[PDB]
Amino acid sequence: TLGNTYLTLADVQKQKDGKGNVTSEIIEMLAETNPILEDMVVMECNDGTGHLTTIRTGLPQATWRRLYEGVQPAKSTTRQIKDSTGTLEAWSEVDEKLVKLSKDKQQLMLNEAAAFLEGMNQTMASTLFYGNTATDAVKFMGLAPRFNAYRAARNLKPVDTADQVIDAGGTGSDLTSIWMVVWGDRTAHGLYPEGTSAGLQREYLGAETKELGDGGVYRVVREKFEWDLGLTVRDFRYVVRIANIDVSDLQAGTIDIYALLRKAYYRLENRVITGGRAALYCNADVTEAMDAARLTPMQVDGKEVMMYRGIPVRECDAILSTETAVPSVA
Amino acid sequence: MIMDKENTFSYKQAITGTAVSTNVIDLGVSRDIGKGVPVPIIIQVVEDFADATSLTATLQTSETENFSSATTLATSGAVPVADLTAGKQLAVQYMPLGTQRYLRVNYTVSGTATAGAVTAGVVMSHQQN
Amino acid sequence: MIMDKENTFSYKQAITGTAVSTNVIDLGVSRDIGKGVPVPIIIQVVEDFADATSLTATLQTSETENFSSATTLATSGAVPVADLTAGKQLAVQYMPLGTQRYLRVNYTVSGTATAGAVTAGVVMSHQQN
Amino acid sequence: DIQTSVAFDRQVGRFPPRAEVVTPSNSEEFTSGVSVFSNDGGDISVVPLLPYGSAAIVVTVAAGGFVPFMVRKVNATGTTSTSIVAV
């Protein structure tokens, strides 16, 4: 006894109007901006079943020759990692007579497609950050669950994921985190599998005929939306997480973000990648806490972009600020 | 991962007690599918276990809907509850060899449990690190 | 089976009496194998056996060169005497997950046989049929 | 009283604008780091700010005097003063 399942006359009456037909200007009131989706690169899954990756793991030991002395041959042992992917789809349903009843069909589907696009962007950003294969096996693993641990004292050289996570100290149900990532072919990028195209794939399935439990066939117009996307952490030494940032102590003057940021930059790897964009991924609370006044922004066409030590600070609305406490691998 | 509905043994099944799998994958012909090109599988534990003690996770295969006489193709052993967290795999990577007619997963538990779930089933490609 | 020396656990090693693999693999650093691309291995009996009750070929790994910290990556189980026949693949088709610096093969036989041999190692392409 | 003509500044130093009388409690935390001074002197057991598991220190501050090491929590048990005021 409801009216929210499929699109009804009320919705088209409320969107398609203006003393006429459908509007080409539907304002996205729920449009959480996630510039992670724009900075992140994509790459076709050439391998075929799970994006593969070869990482150097051992290094040969060169030698100095002493008056015609032999140099033993050297190996170079290599590790290899597989990055599975995941797919999201969606389906529009409008009664064909309803679509025809509105003066326009292309626009009344275009705005409904923009709605689905925004929804997919939001869900994909959320799962890109907090996407876990541990609990949702149908979800490609995001940035967080690959780092839900930390070493007490960092190793001399990065040899584990836990060696790239800084424990900011904290507890409760108000902690947050910060991500410093470099987006690159050899660092990290999106993955659209083979055959499947890159990014969102709007598909307009013309007009079709439906059914019910008792005949009742009626004509519906169905728009199929799909987006496949996998996440790969190449050279994970390019990703550092600052976990357990208590937002309560952050709003007050108990912890300073600049110390955490400098520690993270210390724990990052020096940018040498060519063509690789890099950025900071921190929620609005962090940049609010950046109200501490020489670290300064930088000239890019005079834009609302902080440039912490030559690194853009992209504030992402998807970074939820009530994470779970990150344990320590003692 | 793109793990799908049909060839999937259990979806978030609690098996808190000493239960067995629900979706018994049945094949009319003894293909013994592991041969040749591999097929990835998971018995990854999907949500933590609270008060169990062992989770023997046999991969029993038999020749009848009801497993009157079953055959083991992969057993995890008496895994203590201290490891039954999320992502704790309980068998080999790819499909084993010897899947005669039917396939169901056993979940012999030493004592009962108040929490625990698994997602055993076939996966197109594994997820690692 | 395209076997290879310098990556072979044991070439034509005799099994009689409890013993380990003659050759212990050493992967430079403690990095991983089973993950990513599958790596086929065959701990397979080559020559037939005798009065020995069973056999327990396990794939033990350890960080140290000498194995004082045993870690079972995969176990053959207590295979009975009858099935100790030539061509019996006693362990998993592919390399299990979690390879440390070194790996060994441990043969634990219930009793001692007058016959028995095993050729274990990693092959380029595990040959079925 | 009123200010008309500014001079050199950012060096005069000033007292913290905030203030409130503290009711000591064994289980009650302060949202931000606060400084407490006893109006009548006596023993005061408190919690420092940075070390998240700091146990307690008795300060035995004189009357009107200030307790150093800006305080996270003022414990009722171990406090002899009766006129604690935060700032």
PDB file of C-alpha atoms in Angstrom, chain A residues 38-277:
ATOM      1  CA  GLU A  38      38.130  12.228 -11.438  1.00  0.00           C
ATOM      2  CA  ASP A  39      41.769  12.059 -10.328  1.00  0.00           C
ATOM      3  CA  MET A  40      41.899   8.260 -10.432  1.00  0.00           C
ATOM      4  CA  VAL A  41      43.083   6.779 -13.726  1.00  0.00           C
ATOM      5  CA  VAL A  42      41.589   3.678 -15.353  1.00  0.00           C
ATOM      6  CA  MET A  43      43.129   0.783 -17.256  1.00  0.00           C
ATOM      7  CA  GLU A  44      41.655  -2.127 -19.197  1.00  0.00           C
ATOM      8  CA  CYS A  45      42.100  -5.530 -17.545  1.00  0.00           C
ATOM      9  CA  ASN A  46      44.381  -6.961 -20.216  1.00  0.00           C
ATOM     10  CA  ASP A  47      45.082 -10.102 -18.177  1.00  0.00           C
ATOM     11  CA  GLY A  48      41.459 -11.225 -18.177  1.00  0.00           C
ATOM     12  CA  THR A  49      40.556 -12.737 -14.785  1.00  0.00           C
ATOM     13  CA  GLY A  50      41.637 -10.402 -12.005  1.00  0.00           C
ATOM     14  CA  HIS A  51      43.953  -7.483 -12.742  1.00  0.00           C
ATOM     15  CA  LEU A  52      47.461  -8.837 -12.333  1.00  0.00           C
ATOM     16  CA  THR A  53      50.612  -7.073 -11.171  1.00  0.00           C
ATOM     17  CA  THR A  54      54.340  -7.841 -11.097  1.00  0.00           C
ATOM     18  CA  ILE A  55      56.342  -6.150  -8.339  1.00  0.00           C
ATOM     19  CA  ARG A  56      60.088  -6.415  -7.934  1.00  0.00           C
ATOM     20  CA  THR A  57      60.940  -7.959  -4.588  1.00  0.00           C
ATOM     21  CA  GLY A  58      64.642  -8.816  -4.563  1.00  0.00           C
ATOM     22  CA  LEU A  59      67.530  -6.826  -5.926  1.00  0.00           C
ATOM     23  CA  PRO A  60      70.742  -8.194  -7.442  1.00  0.00           C
ATOM     24  CA  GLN A  61      74.022  -7.457  -5.685  1.00  0.00           C
ATOM     25  CA  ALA A  62      76.569  -5.930  -8.065  1.00  0.00           C
ATOM     26  CA  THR A  63      80.288  -6.383  -7.425  1.00  0.00           C
ATOM     27  CA  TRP A  64      83.656  -4.700  -7.964  1.00  0.00           C
ATOM     28  CA  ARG A  65      86.054  -6.634 -10.181  1.00  0.00           C
ATOM     29  CA  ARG A  66      89.582  -7.071  -8.814  1.00  0.00           C
ATOM     30  CA  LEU A  67      92.169  -7.630 -11.547  1.00  0.00           C
ATOM     31  CA  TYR A  68      90.183 -10.092 -13.683  1.00  0.00           C
ATOM     32  CA  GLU A  69      88.041 -11.560 -10.916  1.00  0.00           C
ATOM     33  CA  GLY A  70      84.750 -13.309 -11.531  1.00  0.00           C
ATOM     34  CA  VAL A  71      81.331 -11.819 -10.838  1.00  0.00           C
ATOM     35  CA  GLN A  72      78.733 -14.373  -9.815  1.00  0.00           C
ATOM     36  CA  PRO A  73      75.386 -14.222 -11.634  1.00  0.00           C
ATOM     37  CA  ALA A  74      72.565 -12.650  -9.677  1.00  0.00           C
ATOM     38  CA  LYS A  75      68.864 -13.390  -9.422  1.00  0.00           C
ATOM     39  CA  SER A  76      66.092 -10.893  -8.757  1.00  0.00           C
ATOM     40  CA  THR A  77      63.138 -12.474  -6.982  1.00  0.00           C
ATOM     41  CA  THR A  78      59.703 -11.105  -7.883  1.00  0.00           C
ATOM     42  CA  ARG A  79      56.349 -11.093  -6.125  1.00  0.00           C
ATOM     43  CA  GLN A  80      53.040 -10.959  -7.972  1.00  0.00           C
ATOM     44  CA  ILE A  81      49.606  -9.796  -6.830  1.00  0.00           C
ATOM     45  CA  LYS A  82      46.097 -10.157  -8.259  1.00  0.00           C
ATOM     46  CA  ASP A  83      43.449  -7.430  -8.006  1.00  0.00           C
ATOM     47  CA  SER A  84      39.892  -8.651  -8.495  1.00  0.00           C
ATOM     48  CA  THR A  85      37.160  -6.332  -9.736  1.00  0.00           C
ATOM     49  CA  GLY A  86      33.457  -5.727  -9.207  1.00  0.00           C
ATOM     50  CA  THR A  87      30.376  -4.550 -11.037  1.00  0.00           C
ATOM     51  CA  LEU A  88      27.391  -2.372 -10.163  1.00  0.00           C
ATOM     52  CA  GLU A  89      24.260  -2.031 -12.269  1.00  0.00           C
ATOM     53  CA  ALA A  90      20.909  -0.297 -12.075  1.00  0.00           C
ATOM     54  CA  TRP A  91      17.625  -0.379 -13.961  1.00  0.00           C
ATOM     55  CA  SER A  92      15.087   2.320 -14.751  1.00  0.00           C
ATOM     56  CA  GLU A  93      11.402   1.500 -15.203  1.00  0.00           C
ATOM     57  CA  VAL A  94       8.768   3.862 -16.583  1.00  0.00           C
ATOM     58  CA  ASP A  95       5.454   2.867 -18.127  1.00  0.00           C
ATOM     59  CA  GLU A  96       5.721   3.442 -21.873  1.00  0.00           C
ATOM     60  CA  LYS A  97       2.443   5.342 -21.894  1.00  0.00           C
ATOM     61  CA  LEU A  98       3.817   7.547 -19.116  1.00  0.00           C
ATOM     62  CA  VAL A  99       6.941   8.366 -21.132  1.00  0.00           C
ATOM     63  CA  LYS A 100       4.916   9.136 -24.252  1.00  0.00           C
ATOM     64  CA  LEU A 101       2.455  11.124 -22.142  1.00  0.00           C
ATOM     65  CA  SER A 102       5.194  13.595 -21.304  1.00  0.00           C
ATOM     66  CA  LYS A 103       5.954  15.635 -24.407  1.00  0.00           C
ATOM     67  CA  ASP A 104       9.585  14.481 -24.453  1.00  0.00           C
ATOM     68  CA  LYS A 105      11.176  11.064 -24.006  1.00  0.00           C
ATOM     69  CA  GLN A 106      14.900  11.705 -24.441  1.00  0.00           C
ATOM     70  CA  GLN A 107      15.080  14.381 -21.746  1.00  0.00           C
ATOM     71  CA  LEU A 108      12.802  12.591 -19.281  1.00  0.00           C
ATOM     72  CA  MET A 109      15.231   9.687 -19.524  1.00  0.00           C
ATOM     73  CA  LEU A 110      18.311  11.932 -19.530  1.00  0.00           C
ATOM     74  CA  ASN A 111      17.535  13.441 -16.140  1.00  0.00           C
ATOM     75  CA  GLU A 112      16.605  10.034 -14.728  1.00  0.00           C
ATOM     76  CA  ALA A 113      19.988   8.858 -16.032  1.00  0.00           C
ATOM     77  CA  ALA A 114      21.777  11.755 -14.341  1.00  0.00           C
ATOM     78  CA  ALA A 115      20.096  10.648 -11.113  1.00  0.00           C
ATOM     79  CA  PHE A 116      21.442   7.119 -11.530  1.00  0.00           C
ATOM     80  CA  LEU A 117      24.865   8.490 -12.460  1.00  0.00           C
ATOM     81  CA  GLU A 118      25.027  10.492  -9.237  1.00  0.00           C
ATOM     82  CA  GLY A 119      23.918   7.484  -7.209  1.00  0.00           C
ATOM     83  CA  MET A 120      26.548   5.255  -8.795  1.00  0.00           C
ATOM     84  CA  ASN A 121      29.219   7.904  -8.215  1.00  0.00           C
ATOM     85  CA  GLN A 122      28.310   8.125  -4.533  1.00  0.00           C
ATOM     86  CA  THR A 123      28.195   4.372  -3.961  1.00  0.00           C
ATOM     87  CA  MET A 124      31.413   3.788  -5.890  1.00  0.00           C
ATOM     88  CA  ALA A 125      33.294   6.469  -3.959  1.00  0.00           C
ATOM     89  CA  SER A 126      32.023   5.009  -0.683  1.00  0.00           C
ATOM     90  CA  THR A 127      33.151   1.526  -1.686  1.00  0.00           C
ATOM     91  CA  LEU A 128      36.399   2.869  -3.127  1.00  0.00           C
ATOM     92  CA  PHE A 129      37.315   4.126   0.324  1.00  0.00           C
ATOM     93  CA  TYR A 130      35.573   1.662   2.679  1.00  0.00           C
ATOM     94  CA  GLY A 131      35.093  -1.287   0.363  1.00  0.00           C
ATOM     95  CA  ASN A 132      35.815  -4.656   1.945  1.00  0.00           C
ATOM     96  CA  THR A 133      36.046  -8.049   0.292  1.00  0.00           C
ATOM     97  CA  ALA A 134      36.175  -9.485   3.816  1.00  0.00           C
ATOM     98  CA  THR A 135      32.439  -8.985   4.391  1.00  0.00           C
ATOM     99  CA  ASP A 136      31.087  -8.091   0.940  1.00  0.00           C
ATOM    100  CA  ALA A 137      32.631 -10.664  -1.390  1.00  0.00           C
ATOM    101  CA  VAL A 138      30.624  -9.012  -4.174  1.00  0.00           C
ATOM    102  CA  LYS A 139      32.434  -5.738  -3.483  1.00  0.00           C
ATOM    103  CA  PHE A 140      35.864  -4.900  -4.850  1.00  0.00           C
ATOM    104  CA  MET A 141      38.184  -4.107  -1.963  1.00  0.00           C
ATOM    105  CA  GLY A 142      38.598  -0.396  -1.352  1.00  0.00           C
ATOM    106  CA  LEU A 143      41.450   1.611   0.073  1.00  0.00           C
ATOM    107  CA  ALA A 144      40.667   1.084   3.752  1.00  0.00           C
ATOM    108  CA  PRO A 145      40.523  -2.687   4.458  1.00  0.00           C
ATOM    109  CA  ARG A 146      43.951  -3.141   2.893  1.00  0.00           C
ATOM    110  CA  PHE A 147      45.300  -1.075   5.808  1.00  0.00           C
ATOM    111  CA  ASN A 148      43.189  -1.864   8.889  1.00  0.00           C
ATOM    112  CA  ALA A 149      46.302  -2.381  11.028  1.00  0.00           C
ATOM    113  CA  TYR A 150      49.521  -0.604  11.962  1.00  0.00           C
ATOM    114  CA  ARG A 151      53.009  -1.331  13.217  1.00  0.00           C
ATOM    115  CA  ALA A 152      53.991   0.299  16.495  1.00  0.00           C
ATOM    116  CA  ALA A 153      57.494   1.281  15.360  1.00  0.00           C
ATOM    117  CA  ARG A 154      57.876   1.597  11.599  1.00  0.00           C
ATOM    118  CA  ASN A 155      60.308  -0.805   9.969  1.00  0.00           C
ATOM    119  CA  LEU A 156      63.499   0.552   8.447  1.00  0.00           C
ATOM    120  CA  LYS A 157      62.042  -0.087   4.990  1.00  0.00           C
ATOM    121  CA  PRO A 158      58.376  -0.499   3.994  1.00  0.00           C
ATOM    122  CA  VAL A 159      57.809  -4.246   3.919  1.00  0.00           C
ATOM    123  CA  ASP A 160      54.121  -4.453   4.798  1.00  0.00           C
ATOM    124  CA  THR A 161      50.824  -2.601   4.593  1.00  0.00           C
ATOM    125  CA  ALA A 162      50.861  -1.991   8.342  1.00  0.00           C
ATOM    126  CA  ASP A 163      54.164  -0.149   7.873  1.00  0.00           C
ATOM    127  CA  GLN A 164      52.348   2.566   5.891  1.00  0.00           C
ATOM    128  CA  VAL A 165      49.608   3.394   8.422  1.00  0.00           C
ATOM    129  CA  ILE A 166      50.153   6.090  11.031  1.00  0.00           C
ATOM    130  CA  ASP A 167      48.226   5.664  14.277  1.00  0.00           C
ATOM    131  CA  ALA A 168      47.127   9.188  15.133  1.00  0.00           C
ATOM    132  CA  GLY A 169      45.887   7.864  18.472  1.00  0.00           C
ATOM    133  CA  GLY A 170      42.235   7.827  19.416  1.00  0.00           C
ATOM    134  CA  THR A 171      39.156   5.773  20.170  1.00  0.00           C
ATOM    135  CA  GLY A 172      35.404   6.151  20.467  1.00  0.00           C
ATOM    136  CA  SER A 173      32.800   6.464  17.735  1.00  0.00           C
ATOM    137  CA  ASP A 174      34.053   9.703  16.187  1.00  0.00           C
ATOM    138  CA  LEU A 175      37.448   8.810  14.686  1.00  0.00           C
ATOM    139  CA  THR A 176      38.287   9.526  11.044  1.00  0.00           C
ATOM    140  CA  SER A 177      41.211   8.967   8.678  1.00  0.00           C
ATOM    141  CA  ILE A 178      43.253  10.673   5.964  1.00  0.00           C
ATOM    142  CA  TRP A 179      44.555   9.209   2.702  1.00  0.00           C
ATOM    143  CA  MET A 180      47.625  10.322   0.778  1.00  0.00           C
ATOM    144  CA  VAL A 181      47.678   8.477  -2.554  1.00  0.00           C
ATOM    145  CA  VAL A 182      49.372   8.897  -5.920  1.00  0.00           C
ATOM    146  CA  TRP A 183      47.214   7.947  -8.900  1.00  0.00           C
ATOM    147  CA  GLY A 184      49.324   6.387 -11.630  1.00  0.00           C
ATOM    148  CA  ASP A 185      49.784   3.415 -13.905  1.00  0.00           C
ATOM    149  CA  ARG A 186      52.524   2.088 -11.625  1.00  0.00           C
ATOM    150  CA  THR A 187      50.818   3.334  -8.441  1.00  0.00           C
ATOM    151  CA  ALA A 188      47.024   3.005  -8.491  1.00  0.00           C
ATOM    152  CA  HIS A 189      44.179   3.308 -10.959  1.00  0.00           C
ATOM    153  CA  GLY A 190      40.707   2.083 -11.773  1.00  0.00           C
ATOM    154  CA  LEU A 191      40.026  -1.119 -13.682  1.00  0.00           C
ATOM    155  CA  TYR A 192      37.333  -1.774 -16.250  1.00  0.00           C
ATOM    156  CA  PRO A 193      37.589  -5.485 -17.172  1.00  0.00           C
ATOM    157  CA  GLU A 194      38.109  -6.799 -20.687  1.00  0.00           C
ATOM    158  CA  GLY A 195      35.129  -6.429 -22.986  1.00  0.00           C
ATOM    159  CA  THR A 196      33.354  -4.159 -20.531  1.00  0.00           C
ATOM    160  CA  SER A 197      33.804  -0.507 -21.438  1.00  0.00           C
ATOM    161  CA  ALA A 198      35.392   2.100 -19.170  1.00  0.00           C
ATOM    162  CA  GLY A 199      33.247   3.941 -16.648  1.00  0.00           C
ATOM    163  CA  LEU A 200      29.479   4.137 -16.586  1.00  0.00           C
ATOM    164  CA  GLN A 201      27.587   2.473 -19.446  1.00  0.00           C
ATOM    165  CA  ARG A 202      24.103   3.865 -20.003  1.00  0.00           C
ATOM    166  CA  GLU A 203      22.028   1.406 -22.032  1.00  0.00           C
ATOM    167  CA  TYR A 204      18.587   2.308 -23.396  1.00  0.00           C
ATOM    168  CA  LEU A 205      16.484  -0.825 -23.849  1.00  0.00           C
ATOM    169  CA  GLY A 206      13.759   0.771 -25.973  1.00  0.00           C
ATOM    170  CA  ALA A 207      10.307  -0.432 -24.943  1.00  0.00           C
ATOM    171  CA  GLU A 208       9.397  -3.779 -23.415  1.00  0.00           C
ATOM    172  CA  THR A 209       6.324  -5.562 -22.074  1.00  0.00           C
ATOM    173  CA  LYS A 210       5.967  -6.493 -18.409  1.00  0.00           C
ATOM    174  CA  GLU A 211       3.915  -9.020 -16.432  1.00  0.00           C
ATOM    175  CA  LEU A 212       2.441  -9.641 -12.991  1.00  0.00           C
ATOM    176  CA  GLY A 213       0.976 -12.505 -10.988  1.00  0.00           C
ATOM    177  CA  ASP A 214      -2.239 -12.271 -13.038  1.00  0.00           C
ATOM    178  CA  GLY A 215      -1.397 -11.350 -16.630  1.00  0.00           C
ATOM    179  CA  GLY A 216      -1.704  -7.583 -16.661  1.00  0.00           C
ATOM    180  CA  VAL A 217       0.921  -6.998 -19.325  1.00  0.00           C
ATOM    181  CA  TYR A 218       1.818  -3.337 -19.767  1.00  0.00           C
ATOM    182  CA  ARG A 219       4.522  -1.504 -21.687  1.00  0.00           C
ATOM    183  CA  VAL A 220       7.584  -0.203 -19.832  1.00  0.00           C
ATOM    184  CA  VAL A 221      10.693   1.647 -20.988  1.00  0.00           C
ATOM    185  CA  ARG A 222      13.791   0.317 -19.235  1.00  0.00           C
ATOM    186  CA  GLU A 223      17.157   2.068 -19.061  1.00  0.00           C
ATOM    187  CA  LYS A 224      20.002  -0.214 -17.987  1.00  0.00           C
ATOM    188  CA  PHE A 225      22.931   1.401 -16.180  1.00  0.00           C
ATOM    189  CA  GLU A 226      26.180  -0.403 -15.461  1.00  0.00           C
ATOM    190  CA  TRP A 227      29.592   0.478 -14.077  1.00  0.00           C
ATOM    191  CA  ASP A 228      32.467  -1.951 -13.587  1.00  0.00           C
ATOM    192  CA  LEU A 229      35.428  -0.824 -11.521  1.00  0.00           C
ATOM    193  CA  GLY A 230      38.395  -2.515  -9.872  1.00  0.00           C
ATOM    194  CA  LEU A 231      41.015  -0.960  -7.614  1.00  0.00           C
ATOM    195  CA  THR A 232      44.714  -1.862  -7.738  1.00  0.00           C
ATOM    196  CA  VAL A 233      47.422  -0.700  -5.345  1.00  0.00           C
ATOM    197  CA  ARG A 234      50.621  -0.827  -7.366  1.00  0.00           C
ATOM    198  CA  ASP A 235      53.724  -0.027  -5.325  1.00  0.00           C
ATOM    199  CA  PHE A 236      51.646   0.323  -2.160  1.00  0.00           C
ATOM    200  CA  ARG A 237      54.479   2.480  -0.780  1.00  0.00           C
ATOM    201  CA  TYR A 238      52.548   5.279  -2.511  1.00  0.00           C
ATOM    202  CA  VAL A 239      49.572   5.028  -0.120  1.00  0.00           C
ATOM    203  CA  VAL A 240      49.741   6.119   3.530  1.00  0.00           C
ATOM    204  CA  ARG A 241      46.821   6.172   5.969  1.00  0.00           C
ATOM    205  CA  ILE A 242      46.523   8.246   9.146  1.00  0.00           C
ATOM    206  CA  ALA A 243      44.014   6.306  11.219  1.00  0.00           C
ATOM    207  CA  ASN A 244      42.044   6.872  14.418  1.00  0.00           C
ATOM    208  CA  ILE A 245      41.884  10.661  14.066  1.00  0.00           C
ATOM    209  CA  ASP A 246      39.414  11.588  16.810  1.00  0.00           C
ATOM    210  CA  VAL A 247      37.233  14.318  15.310  1.00  0.00           C
ATOM    211  CA  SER A 248      36.239  15.473  18.801  1.00  0.00           C
ATOM    212  CA  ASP A 249      39.844  16.146  19.789  1.00  0.00           C
ATOM    213  CA  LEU A 250      40.377  17.545  16.290  1.00  0.00           C
ATOM    214  CA  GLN A 251      37.704  20.243  16.499  1.00  0.00           C
ATOM    215  CA  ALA A 252      39.309  21.286  19.769  1.00  0.00           C
ATOM    216  CA  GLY A 253      43.018  21.922  20.096  1.00  0.00           C
ATOM    217  CA  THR A 254      44.221  18.506  21.247  1.00  0.00           C
ATOM    218  CA  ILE A 255      45.869  17.106  18.095  1.00  0.00           C
ATOM    219  CA  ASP A 256      47.356  19.039  15.177  1.00  0.00           C
ATOM    220  CA  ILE A 257      46.834  17.789  11.634  1.00  0.00           C
ATOM    221  CA  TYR A 258      50.131  19.239  10.435  1.00  0.00           C
ATOM    222  CA  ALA A 259      52.175  16.840  12.567  1.00  0.00           C
ATOM    223  CA  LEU A 260      50.194  13.920  11.170  1.00  0.00           C
ATOM    224  CA  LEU A 261      50.604  15.223   7.619  1.00  0.00           C
ATOM    225  CA  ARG A 262      54.360  15.653   7.981  1.00  0.00           C
ATOM    226  CA  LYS A 263      54.640  12.161   9.452  1.00  0.00           C
ATOM    227  CA  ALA A 264      52.670  10.763   6.516  1.00  0.00           C
ATOM    228  CA  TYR A 265      54.789  12.625   3.965  1.00  0.00           C
ATOM    229  CA  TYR A 266      57.821  11.162   5.704  1.00  0.00           C
ATOM    230  CA  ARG A 267      56.252   7.726   5.322  1.00  0.00           C
ATOM    231  CA  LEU A 268      55.297   8.306   1.671  1.00  0.00           C
ATOM    232  CA  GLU A 269      57.544   7.508  -1.299  1.00  0.00           C
ATOM    233  CA  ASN A 270      59.151  10.389  -3.182  1.00  0.00           C
ATOM    234  CA  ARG A 271      57.224  11.229  -6.337  1.00  0.00           C
ATOM    235  CA  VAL A 272      59.184   9.976  -9.332  1.00  0.00           C
ATOM    236  CA  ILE A 273      56.225   8.656 -11.313  1.00  0.00           C
ATOM    237  CA  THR A 274      55.630  10.307 -14.684  1.00  0.00           C
ATOM    238  CA  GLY A 275      52.074  11.246 -15.573  1.00  0.00           C
ATOM    239  CA  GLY A 276      50.897  10.242 -12.109  1.00  0.00           C
ATOM    240  CA  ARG A 277      48.503  12.583 -10.340  1.00  0.00           C
TER     241      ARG A 277
END
